[PDB]
Amino acid sequence: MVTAKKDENFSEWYTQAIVRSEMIEYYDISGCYIMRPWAFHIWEKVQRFFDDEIKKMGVENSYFPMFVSRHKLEKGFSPEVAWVTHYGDSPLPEKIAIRPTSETIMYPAYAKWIRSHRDLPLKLNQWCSVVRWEFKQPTPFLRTREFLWQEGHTAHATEEEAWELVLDILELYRRWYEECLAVPVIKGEKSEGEKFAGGKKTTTVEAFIPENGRGIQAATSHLLGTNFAKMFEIEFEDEEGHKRLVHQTSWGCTTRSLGVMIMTHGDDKGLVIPPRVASVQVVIIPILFKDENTGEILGKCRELKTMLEKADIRVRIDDRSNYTPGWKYNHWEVKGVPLRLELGPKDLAKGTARVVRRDTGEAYQISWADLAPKLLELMEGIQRSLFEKAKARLHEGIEKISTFDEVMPALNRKHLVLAPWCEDPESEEQIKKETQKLSEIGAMKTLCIPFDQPPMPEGTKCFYTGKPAKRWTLWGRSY
């Protein structure tokens, strides 16, 4: 059972939620954690969703090696690279790196495979793990030294096509968070300071954690332009016979998405799992005490299960004899199962079951015949309700502002700011260092420049420099 309160010590709440729900087991190698089945089933759901969707785009899965040779890799990231130096007691002739990301592993093959327009677009993805020796404080799911992800890497004849894929993938990430995990996200573009330096333009979806006021990057999708094509000699011949550079994209999203879901929907009793990604949508609990009707309770439970499955409802009967009914309520609650159905002798006689929804704790008396459609209705309710409350909290957490003098107070309130900005280079660093300084007495950075821009009245000035502002940019402390 969870005892830390979400609104008091947040980090201790998160730790308790993930351990006691049996999502995570701690591990002796710092920054790495065991994903137990209750968390893994969720990853399988979002994984199957994203994967199905990219397959409709013609993206194919592959698998490239987890090792890259020193010299290929080495053609502020260097301190993060894990190096294999020995096999048994023998030193490798040359040390070898574990993949922090796969550009240096995939792009030489791309140069080889692409010869003409007939070879494009090339669209590949892989699901795998990557290793980065993160210097920031690690946190399960959100920042780990080994994490699971997919990375997609595509190559196109033209920028327009490449860019169209960038946005398509970004929309899939919106759907992963918003439609599967009921977590709202803001699409936007990274500032010049925050974008992937290997690319032309980096797009993102950004989420927000109210309890610590932290913005967090949810996924990423890069228009790479042609710089990688120039670096790796990825060229093709047009249908006219000339040699052209390819236009590339890459995109990735990780098990971080699970941590974001946990933090968003969790409460003081622990986990709350959105029905769309819950492996157990409805747990059925037989109420057994003093031998009253034991066999008839269990029988109708099996009957209800079969009925609910016809409607594609994912149902588990917890008929384990070595646990009390009250232990079961607690167990499945801390685990965040969206609906609990209880069946004792009193309920049995009536042709009804008592059903409790995990998000609000509301109980329903429902007749056996109304079950399938009532539960489907409740599950859409839960899913939509989880999302809309999270959305309202996201919007309560963002403050529209005009001047730097408004910044520090908004941060103390654990909010982000949407502020007009000239998008100058020195600016962001200045702002980072200064909010850094005022906080110590930490830093605030740009999260993104939202795609959805409020109007910009003529003559409005950059909130920091005083110069003419360009667009509204979202800022805050972040992960």
Ligand X SMILES: O=C1CCCN[C@@H]1CCCn1cnc2cc(F)c(F)cc2c1=O
Ligand Y SMILES: Nc1ncnc2c1ncn2[C@@H]1O[C@H](COP(=O)(O)OP(=O)(O)NP(=O)(O)O)[C@@H](O)[C@H]1O
Q: Name the residues that contact ligand X, by CB under 6 A.
A: 77, 80-81, 100-101, 103, 132, 151, 196, 220, 222, 250-252
Q: Which does 312 bind (CB under 5 to 8 A by kind): ligand Y, ligand X, a copy of itself, none?
A: none
Paired residues of 47 in beta bridges: none
Is 80 or 171 the residue whose CB approaches ligand X more closely?
A: 80
Q: Based on CB atoms, which residue is closest to ligand X, 132 or 276?
A: 132
Single residue of 2, 148, 182, 308 touching a copy of itself by CB under 8 A: 148
CB of 45 to a copy of itself, least distance (A): 11
| Peptide bond before residue 409 is cis, with ω within 30 degrees of 0 | no
H-run or E-run covering 420: strand 416-421
Q: Which two tokens stand for residue 189?
A: 């573009």
With respect to ligand Y, which residue has the nearer C-beta, 222 or 331?
222
Sites for a copy of itself among residues 111-130 (CB under 8 A): 112-113, 116-118, 124, 128-129
Output 220 or 257, the one with its CB closest to ligand X. Answer: 220
The binder of 251, among ligand X, ligand Y, a copy of itself, none, by C-beta within 5 to 8 A per type, is ligand X
Tokens of 240: 């006219």
Q: Is 48 helix (H, G, I), strand (E, B) or coil?
A: helix
Alpha helices in 397-463 (DSSP H): 407-412, 425-440
Q: Does 144 engage in binding with ligand Y (CB under 6 A)? A: yes
Per the CB < 8 A criterion, the answer to whether 180 and 277 are in contact is yes
The CA distance from 263 to 46, in Å, is: 17
CA distance 103 to 151: 10
DSSP code of residue 139: B
**Binding residue for a copy of itself, selected from 60, 292, 380, 396, defined by CB under 8 A:** 60
Site residues for ligand Y, 210-229, by CB under 6 A, read: 217-220
Which run of H or E residues covers position 316?
strand 315-317
Report whether 30 contacts 261 (CB < 8 A). Answer: no
User: Binding partner of residue 250 among ligand X, a copy of itself, ligand Y, none, CB under 5 to 8 Å per kind?
Assistant: ligand X
CB of 62 to ligand X, least distance (A): 14
**Residue from the set 50, 147, 387, 472 that interacts with ligand Y by CB under 6 A:** 147
- Of 342, 339, 336, 341, the residue nearest 377 (C-alpha): 339
| Closest approach of ligand Y to the CB of residue 81, in Å | 13
What residues have CB less than 8 Å from 254, skipping those under 6 apart? 147, 148, 149
Q: Nearest distance from residue 253's CB to ligand Y, in Å?
A: 6
Span near ligand Y by CB under 6 A; candidates 59-67, 139-147, 368-376, 427-435: 139-147
* Radius of gyration of the chain from its Cα atoms, rounded to whole angstroms: 26
> How many residues contact ligand Y, by CB under 6 A?
14
Cβ neighbours around 150 below 10 Å, total: 19
Q: Is 184 in the site for ligand Y (CB under 6 A)?
A: no
Distance in Å, CB of 94 to ligand X, minimum:
16
Is residue 69 a contact point for a copy of itself (CB under 8 A)? yes
Cα–Cα distance between 231 and 250 in angstroms, integer? Answer: 16
Can you give the length of the chain in residues? Answer: 479
190 neighbors 155 (Cβ within 8 angstroms): no
Task: Give the interface with a copy of itself as residue ranges (CB under 8 A).
Answer: 25, 27-29, 32-37, 40-41, 43-44, 60-69, 72, 78-90, 95-96, 98, 109, 112-113, 116-118, 124, 128-129, 131, 133, 146, 148, 320-323
